[PDB]
């Protein structure tokens with residue numbers, strides 16, 4: 770978040786927690802009441818065959 | 819007595835545009851990002867429906 774003087778005054782870490790994911794997805798530091806789709810859960814591979 | 823049949827709703831289909839185009843591919847995803855919001859806008863339109 771850049772303020773009027775071009776100084777970064779805040780930030781969202783888009784992988785910190787589920788609310789931060791919503792803020793990042795909506796490109797906003799404020800999230801209104803509701804349900805939002807932000808990501809896709811995926812199981813990762815553990816072996817190489 | 820007559821019967822009048824009307825549809826009310828569609829199946830609530832939702833498509834993950836990234837998984838559809840670039841499933842399990844980092845190299846493809848990086849190229850997909852060069853198209854900006856095209857992928858996000860499609861997800862938004864389906865959500866709206």
Ligand SMILES: *[C@@H]1O[C@H](CO)[C@@H](O)[C@H](O)[C@H]1NC(C)=O
Nearest residue numbers: 771772773774775776777778
């Ligand atoms: C921009 O700088 C001026 C001082 O020149 C200060 O008074 C003003 O509050 C600053 N704006 C912001 C958004 O911090």
